[PDB]
Amino acid sequence: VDFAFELRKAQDTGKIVMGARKSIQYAKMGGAKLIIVARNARPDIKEDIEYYARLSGIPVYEFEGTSVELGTLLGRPHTVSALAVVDPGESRILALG
Numbered sequence: 001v002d003f004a005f006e007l008r009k010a011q012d013t014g015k016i017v018m019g020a021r022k023s024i025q026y027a028k029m030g031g032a033k034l035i036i037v038a039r040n041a042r043p044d045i046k047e048d049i050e051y052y053a054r055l056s057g058i059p060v061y062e063f064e065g066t067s068v069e070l071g072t073l074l075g076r077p078h079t080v081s082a083l084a085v086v087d088p089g090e091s092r093i094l095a096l097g
Contacts, residue, residue, distance in 0.1 A: 003063070004073055006091040007036075011074060014089025018074060020045045023084040027052035032084035034097050035060045038067040041081040049082050059097035 010016055017026055020041070026032035027049065035053050037046055037060055053060045063070050071080040088094050 001092055001095050003096070006093045006095075007073055009091035010085060010087070010089050010093040012089070014085070014091060014093075015087030016074070017084045017086055018076070018080050018082075020049055020082045023082040024049055024052050026084040026086060027056050027058050030056045030058070032056075032058055032086055033088060034058065034085040034094055035082060036063050036070070036085070036096070037061075037082045038063050038065065038070045038080070040066050045081065061096040 017023065023032065023035050027035060035049060035058055037049055039062060050060060067079040067081040071078055074080055085093055
């Protein structure tokens with residue numbers, strides 16, 4: 001699965017929500033279809049995300065990259081340490097699950 005491509009595709013054709021806060025929020029509300037977390041997401045933040053996702057049976061795929069690398073992918077001027085896919089759109093981003 002072409003992560004970078006599929007991520008962008010889901011960005012351009014679906015619904016992704018960025019940030020640890022929002023991802024935990026969509027996890028506990030079960031609104032998220034998948035969560036992506038940066039390899040180096042801050043351990044205390046990463047553990048909570050990973051807990052809420054598990055609580056809700058939501059899949060989590062660890063991006064093998066940094067949060068500055070994930071942020072640059074999403075074309076953001078800032079770090080992204082986790083993201084929740086609400087709508088995959090036309091992409092295969094759920095195949096990461």
